Ligand binder design. Structure first.
Ligand SMILES: N=C(N)c1ccc(Oc2cc(Oc3ccc(C(=N)N)cc3)cc(C(=O)N[C@H]3CC[C@H](N)CC3)c2)cc1
Lengths: 241, 4
């Protein structure tokens, strides 16, 4: 997260850290139920040196605050038994950049570990609305991951504005969130994490998944996120949640 | 869901 601040401990108890074996934090994810996480399909692609698509190559850390204290009281470690990349995920455009991760054993709910609410399919996170991005990714483009979970406040951008700023790259699954002036944005390492939106009774709903952006926090280059409401029914069909 |  560029332009953000240290989160308070347990402030985002649905934010999860995904570590690939021998490599540390790679992507974020969100807890949605005792058994399931949401993340970005782009985190789980094999390459020639590592089968990032193989659930057995991962560890999920729930209730995590600081990457240098992964065994703190409250932190839960879990393996994965399944990764479900969206079937329409496109490598090249990042269309349908969403994945469901099945925990090998359920999470225990606690003050530090709690699911985010999911929005119904017809819900629309309106243009202009403030929402929160969180993660352990770079705090500057080309720059170092944060040890301590970061939070940043960003706003949903009009779809037409978005398409025009990033020509031939924005599909209706995508949403621009951030600022035309830059300054606050997600970045490398935040991939797969949730946008948290404070809704009408103050409960937090997931508004999006960190997907991509051109650099981080540049003027006229807001972050691009996978919309959640579009996938409510897919999440149900695949997970029972 | 959705609170600390
Ligand atoms: N808000 C931000 N500023 C922001 C948010 C998230 C970020 O994370 C990533 C992470 C990323 O990492 C990947 C590692 C690896 C494998 C792989 N195994 N092939 C894929 C993706 C790539 C990209 C990237 O640039 N993707 C392109 C997708 C197509 C699009 N039309 C052009 C850009 C961005 C970075 C910035």
């Amino acid at each position: 997260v560029v332009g953000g601040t240290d989160a308070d401990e347990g402030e985002w108890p649905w934010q999860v850290s995904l570590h690939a074996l021998g490599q540390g934090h790679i992507c974020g994810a969100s807890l949605i139920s005792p058994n399931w996480l949401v993340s970005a399909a782009h985190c789980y692609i094999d390459d020639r040196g590592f089968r990032y698509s193989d659930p057995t190559q991962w560890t999920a850390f729930l209730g995590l605050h600081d990457q240098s204290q992964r065994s703190a009281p409250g932190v839960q470690e879990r393996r994965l038994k399944r990764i479900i990349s969206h079937p329409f995920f496109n490598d090249f455009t990042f269309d349908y950049d969403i994945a469901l991760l099945e925990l090998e054993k359920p999470a225990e709910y606690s003050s530090m570990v709690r699911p985010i609410c999911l929005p119904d399919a017809s819900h629309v996170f309106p243009a202009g609305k403030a929402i929160w991005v969180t993660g352990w990714g770079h705090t500057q483009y080309g720059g170092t991951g944060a040890l301590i979970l970061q939070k940043g406040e960003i706003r949903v951008i009009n779809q037409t504005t978005c398409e025009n700023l990033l020509p031939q790259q924005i599909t209706p699954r995508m949403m621009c969130v951030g600022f035309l002036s830059g300054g606050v944005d997600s970045c490398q390492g935040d991939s797969g994490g949730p946008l948290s939106s404070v809704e009408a009774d103050g409960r937090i709903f997931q508004a999006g998944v960190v997907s991509w952006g051109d650099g981080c926090a540049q003027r006229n280059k807001p972050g691009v996120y996978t919309r959640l409401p579009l996938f409510r029914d897919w999440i149900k069909e695949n997970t029972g949640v | 869901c959705g609170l600390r």
